PDB file of C-alpha atoms in Angstrom:
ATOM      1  CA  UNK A   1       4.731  -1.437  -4.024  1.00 39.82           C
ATOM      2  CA  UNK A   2       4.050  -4.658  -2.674  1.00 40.64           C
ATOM      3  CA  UNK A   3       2.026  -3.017   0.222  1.00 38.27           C
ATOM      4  CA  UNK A   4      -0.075  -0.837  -2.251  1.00 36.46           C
ATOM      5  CA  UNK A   5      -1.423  -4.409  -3.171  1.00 37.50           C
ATOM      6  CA  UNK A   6      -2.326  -5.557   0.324  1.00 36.95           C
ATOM      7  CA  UNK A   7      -4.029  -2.155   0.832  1.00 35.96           C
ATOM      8  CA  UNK A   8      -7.220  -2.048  -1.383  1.00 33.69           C
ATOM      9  CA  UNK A   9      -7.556  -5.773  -2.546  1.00 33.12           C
ATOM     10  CA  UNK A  10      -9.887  -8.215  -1.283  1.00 32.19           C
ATOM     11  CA  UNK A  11      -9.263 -11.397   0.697  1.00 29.50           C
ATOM     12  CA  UNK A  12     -10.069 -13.722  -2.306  1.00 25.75           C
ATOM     13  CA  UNK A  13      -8.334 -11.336  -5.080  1.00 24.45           C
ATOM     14  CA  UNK A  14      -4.712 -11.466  -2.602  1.00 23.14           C
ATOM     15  CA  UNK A  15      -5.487 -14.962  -1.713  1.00 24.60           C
ATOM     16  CA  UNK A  16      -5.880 -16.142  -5.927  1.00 25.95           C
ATOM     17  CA  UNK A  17      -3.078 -13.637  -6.382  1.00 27.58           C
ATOM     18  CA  UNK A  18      -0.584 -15.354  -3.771  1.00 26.53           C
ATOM     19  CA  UNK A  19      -1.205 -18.582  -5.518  1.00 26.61           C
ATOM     20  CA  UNK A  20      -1.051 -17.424  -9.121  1.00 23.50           C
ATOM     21  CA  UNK A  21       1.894 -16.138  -8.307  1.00 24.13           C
ATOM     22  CA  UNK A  22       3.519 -18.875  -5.702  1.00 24.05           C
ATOM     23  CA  UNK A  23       2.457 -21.278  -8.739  1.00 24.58           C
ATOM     24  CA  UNK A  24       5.023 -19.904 -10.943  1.00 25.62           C
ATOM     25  CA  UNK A  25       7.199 -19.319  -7.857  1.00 24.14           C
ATOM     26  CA  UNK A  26       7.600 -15.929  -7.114  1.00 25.95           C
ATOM     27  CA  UNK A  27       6.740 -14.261  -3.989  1.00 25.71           C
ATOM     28  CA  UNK A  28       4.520 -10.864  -3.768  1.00 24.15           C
ATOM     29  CA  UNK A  29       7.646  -9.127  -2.481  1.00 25.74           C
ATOM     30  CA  UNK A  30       9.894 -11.078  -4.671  1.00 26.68           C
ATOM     31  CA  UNK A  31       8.011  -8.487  -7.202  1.00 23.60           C
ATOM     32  CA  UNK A  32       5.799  -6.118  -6.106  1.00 26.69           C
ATOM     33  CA  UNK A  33       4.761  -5.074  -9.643  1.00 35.44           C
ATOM     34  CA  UNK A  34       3.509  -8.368 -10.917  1.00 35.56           C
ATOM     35  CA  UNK A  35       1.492  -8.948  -7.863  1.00 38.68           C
ATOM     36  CA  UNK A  36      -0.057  -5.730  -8.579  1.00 43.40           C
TER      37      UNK A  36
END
């Protein structure tokens, strides 16, 4: 899931994740694989 991600992440791995993945435009829930 997306929530698996949240879980056992850091703050600055979920942070550079959210960004990576807002800079192609796609939101962690949008696809909870790829922000895995």
């Amino acid at each position: 899931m997306e929530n698996f991600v949240r879980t056992n992440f850091n703050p600055m791995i979920l942070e550079r994740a959210e960004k990576t993945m807002k800079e192609y435009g796609e939101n962690p829930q949008n696809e909870g694989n790829k922000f895995a």
